[model samples]
Target: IQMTQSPSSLSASVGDRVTITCRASQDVNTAVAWYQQKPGKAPKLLIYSASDLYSGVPSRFSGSRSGTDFTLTISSLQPEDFATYYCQQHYTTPPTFGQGTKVEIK
Candidate 1:
């Protein structure tokens, strides 16, 4: 299945709340993962199995799933939170990734 992320990009500041959405071409259940990527850096896992946060991830980072849609929310956006987010579904062979959503300074 393919993943489609919305907005493509956004502008916000520290302390603000932000949410990124990813929709799959097919239902992927809770097999989704959220990742954070910065310029010239590898993608870092933030959430897995839809809403499960990865170890060492900040409390402000969270994810949710509903059918074929997934959401990644930053409860309190921090300075280091400005970056691109991508969602992937591993429910099937060869996981698929969303195009990405870039978070920028407002």
Candidate 2:
């Protein structure tokens, strides 16, 4: 299923709380995943299966889901957290990704 992310971009600073949302075109159960990516770098999985944290990721990163909608929340934003975030779904044969949301320094 196709994925769509909201608020294409946002501005924030250290210690701020940042949230990015994503929605699937079709019901995806809990097959959704979230990633963080920096310029010219590969996407790093932050959350998998909708709300489970990936190994080695910081606890400050959390995720939750409501039906086909998913949310990624950064409890406390850090300098290294200023990057592009994406939501992906593996419910279908071919995984799909959202357009992405950019978090910039404010």
Candidate 3:
């Protein structure tokens, strides 16, 4: 299934709340995940299924999917949170990420 994200880009400063949305072309049930990507480092998995938060991550990152709709939300944007965010489905085969949402400085 294909996932689509919006607002290709947005401006934010530290402490701001950043939320990016993604929707799958087909329903993948509850198998969805979100990621944080920096320029040089590999993407970091922040959430899995059922409010599963990965270790070594901030409580700021949150996400999930109910059917084909998914949400990527950061409770509080930290300096480290400024970058690219992507969402994907684990329930569907050939899993792929949505285009992406880039968060930049104001």
Candidate 4:
């Protein structure tokens, strides 16, 4: 499946809240996942389809499902959240990632 996003860049200061959205070409509500990536590190899994935390991720990051749209929200923007966020669907043979959304300091 393919995913897409809009307003690919967002500006937020520290402690601000922000949300990025991902849409799947089909109804992938049960196969969606969210991930975060820093400047020079591997991507960190944030949420699974059921909004379950990925092992050690902090509680501040979360995801929710509404129809065909999935959202990854950061309650209070942290310096670490100032990176790229991506969503993937693993319900199919090959998982696909949305066009990354970059979070920057305003």
Candidate 5:
């Protein structure tokens, strides 16, 4: 499955809320997952499906979705949260990820 993520990169200050969206080729509904990857680190699963948080993910990270559109929102970003985020589709065979969105400090 193919996904599209916008604003390849963004600049924002700490404590700011940021949203990244991914539109799947087809309706994935709750079958989407959100991931966070910092420099030199492996991706961490923040969300599984549209609403369920991963094992260590807190409530601050949430996902919202409608039809083919899915969003991962960080209620408030921290200095260490600057990284490239990705969304993936798990509803279909051969999972695929969004191009990725990079968040920067302002």
Candidate 6:
């Protein structure tokens, strides 16, 4: 499904919580995934399907859903969360990604 994002960027402090939103071209209630990326590191899977944590990810990252709106939330944001975040849908073939939200420290 085709997806779109807004604002594209956000600023937060080290301990501030931030959220990113994603929308699908169609219903994607089955599975959703969140990923994080830093400057020189590969993207790391954070949360999946609204609340399922990916193996090995820290507990600080969380996700939830309300209707078609999927949310990736960072609680007590850390220095490492200050990167880019992406939301993906796994409910359909040809999986798609949100336009990525860049998290920056002010």
Q: What is the TM-score of each predicted model, taking all chains together?
A: 0.96, 0.97, 0.90, 0.92, 0.94, 0.90
Error of 1 at 105 (Å): 0.1
lDDT of 5: 0.88
Between candidates 1 and 3, the one scoring higher on lDDT is 1
lDDT of 4: 0.84
The TM-score, computed over Cα atoms with residue i paired to residue i, of candidate 6 is 0.90
Over 1-106, each residue of candidate 5 has an lDDT whose tens digit, in order, gives: 7899987999898889999999988877688888999989999988887778988777778998988899888888888788999998988878888999999988
Give me the runs in candidate 2 sitting further than 4 Å from their true place: none
lDDT, candidate 4, 1-106, per-residue tens: 7887644989999998788887778887568888888889998888897378899888888888787788888899887678888888897878888888989899
Q: Which ten residues in a row have the lowest lDDT in candidate 2?
A: 88-97
Note the Cα lDDT for every prediction shown: 0.92, 0.93, 0.80, 0.84, 0.88, 0.82
lDDT of 6 by residue, 1-106 (tens): 8666544999989888788888777777848888898988898888877789988888878888876778888888888678898888888777788899999989
Q: What is the lDDT of residue 23 in candidate 5?
A: 90
Give candidate 6's error at residue 10 in angstroms: 0.4
| lDDT (10s digit) by residue, model 3, range 1-106 | 7878887999988888777888878767778788878999999888887258899877777775666778877888787788888887777677788888899999
lDDT value, candidate 3, whole model: 0.80
- In model 1, the runs with Cα more than 4 Å from the true position are none
State which candidate, 1 or 6, has the greater lDDT: 1
Poorly placed runs, candidate 5 (over 4 Å): none
Please identify which of the two predictions, 2 or 3, would achieve the higher TM-score against the true structure. 2
Poorest lDDT segment (10 consecutive residues) of candidate 6: 1-10
Q: Per-residue CA lDDT of candidate 1, range 3-97, in tens?
A: 89997999998999999999899877799999999999999999999999999999999999888889999999999999999999898878888
